Scaffold this motif. Sequence first.
Motif, PDB file in Angstrom:
ATOM      1  N   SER A   1       0.916  -1.185  -0.054  1.00 29.24           N
ATOM      2  CA  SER A   1      -0.077   0.028  -0.115  1.00 29.24           C
ATOM      3  C   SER A   1       0.848   1.379  -0.024  1.00 29.24           C
ATOM      4  O   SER A   1       0.493   2.023  -0.672  1.00 29.24           O
ATOM      5  N   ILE A   2       1.715   1.249   0.736  1.00 26.30           N
ATOM      6  CA  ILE A   2       2.956   2.300   0.797  1.00 26.30           C
ATOM      7  C   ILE A   2       3.547   2.301  -0.611  1.00 26.30           C
ATOM      8  O   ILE A   2       3.569   3.412  -1.132  1.00 26.30           O
TER       9      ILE A   2
ATOM     10  N   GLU B   1      15.177   4.897   3.658  1.00 25.43           N
ATOM     11  CA  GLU B   1      14.327   4.133   2.651  1.00 25.43           C
ATOM     12  C   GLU B   1      14.155   5.011   1.438  1.00 25.43           C
ATOM     13  O   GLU B   1      14.044   6.286   1.384  1.00 25.43           O
TER      14      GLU B   1
ATOM     15  N   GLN C   1       0.597   3.553  -3.059  1.00 23.67           N
ATOM     16  CA  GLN C   1       0.465   5.142  -2.842  1.00 23.67           C
ATOM     17  C   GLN C   1       1.719   5.814  -3.511  1.00 23.67           C
ATOM     18  O   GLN C   1       1.488   7.148  -4.108  1.00 23.67           O
TER      19      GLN C   1
ATOM     20  N   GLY D   1       4.025  11.957   3.153  1.00 28.09           N
ATOM     21  CA  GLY D   1       2.734  11.328   3.807  1.00 28.09           C
ATOM     22  C   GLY D   1       2.933  10.076   3.980  1.00 28.09           C
ATOM     23  O   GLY D   1       1.975   9.346   4.623  1.00 28.09           O
ATOM     24  N   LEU D   2       4.027   9.257   3.621  1.00 32.06           N
ATOM     25  CA  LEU D   2       4.113   7.821   3.779  1.00 32.06           C
ATOM     26  C   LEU D   2       5.427   7.617   4.824  1.00 32.06           C
ATOM     27  O   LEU D   2       4.946   6.909   5.618  1.00 32.06           O
ATOM     28  N   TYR D   3       6.604   8.124   4.318  1.00 32.56           N
ATOM     29  CA  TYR D   3       7.801   8.169   5.246  1.00 32.56           C
ATOM     30  C   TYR D   3       7.600   9.454   6.148  1.00 32.56           C
ATOM     31  O   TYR D   3       7.512  10.417   5.478  1.00 32.56           O
ATOM     32  N   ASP D   4       7.821   9.313   7.482  1.00 33.01           N
ATOM     33  CA  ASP D   4       8.060  10.417   8.170  1.00 33.01           C
ATOM     34  C   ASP D   4       9.345  11.102   8.020  1.00 33.01           C
ATOM     35  O   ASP D   4       9.339  12.483   7.885  1.00 33.01           O
ATOM     36  N   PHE D   5      10.356  10.521   7.200  1.00 28.63           N
ATOM     37  CA  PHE D   5      11.520  10.965   7.164  1.00 28.63           C
ATOM     38  C   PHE D   5      11.612  11.462   5.570  1.00 28.63           C
ATOM     39  O   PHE D   5      12.684  11.646   5.021  1.00 28.63           O
TER      40      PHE D   5
END
Lengths: 163, 161
Positions: free
Chosen positions: B1-2, B83, B5, B40-44
């Motif tokens: 899903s990540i 990542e 998206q 909006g997926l990875y905080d970083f």
Amino acid sequence: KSIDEQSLHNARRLFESGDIDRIEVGTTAGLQQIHRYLFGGLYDFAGQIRYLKEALVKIEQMPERTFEEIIAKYVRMNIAHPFLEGNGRSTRIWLDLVLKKNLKKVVNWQNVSKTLYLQAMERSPVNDLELRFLLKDNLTDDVDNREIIFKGIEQSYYYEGYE
Amino acid sequence: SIDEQSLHNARRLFESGDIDRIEVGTTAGLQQIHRYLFGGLYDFAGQIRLKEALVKIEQMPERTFEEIIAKYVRMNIAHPFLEGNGRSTRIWLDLVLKKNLKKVVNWQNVSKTLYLQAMERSPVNDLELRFLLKDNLTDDVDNREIIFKGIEQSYYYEGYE
């Protein structure tokens, strides 16, 4: 693996620090707290819910008196799939807290085979018998044993492919 | 899903034409791509996990194919994000190739197995990587078929399909 590896350490820290005891048991907010702790600083949507809102309300209101009731509640939360990612690892911790509160037992996940768990979970929407039979055979009242906890977390992450 | 998206984010980057505002061949530019792809997926997202090394890398010349690939390999070793390095850096590479050589990589024709082998070998010798990518360059840099099929292949490299 770097995301998963850091989350694994977060999961370990959750129990070691005793922060696990501050988690609200059997509620949506509680599940969010777990997800936030596990994936905080990794997922932007950590602790955030991805109708789904009304379904979660009904799920948390489900009773938790018996093993059968707890598993039934667990299965709908799994079907609900409230987060974009990290549902299984967070929900399994969510399940254990519910089992510990009501039955004074937790799942000894290290003895729960990956193959049997995935099959039972896959089948659970139709019939949770396989899941109930598997997990009941692996309950333990040694709920504060760190070996069971850390090995359990490792197995939980193993379920989704991390090793 | 990540990944699914993120794939849509990658597609929107070219569709919206936002790709043209990305700074080419710089650290900040790479961050812009990473932010766009994983926002909006990875905080970083867009954040560096090294900084002085990155400064040295972006200052590397981009005059020849050989130079660009050398710069690309250097960035790969740097591994500036926790990542999403590979997907974002390949877009970073294409912008550099387009700017300097007016060409991009036709990724859809670049085999996963051969690409991964060449990348694994590149720190020791980038011959395999240079050869593989060179055979799949195209001057049709605005072909949307090549672009979208390329993005799909890029995401396939890390396991999403």
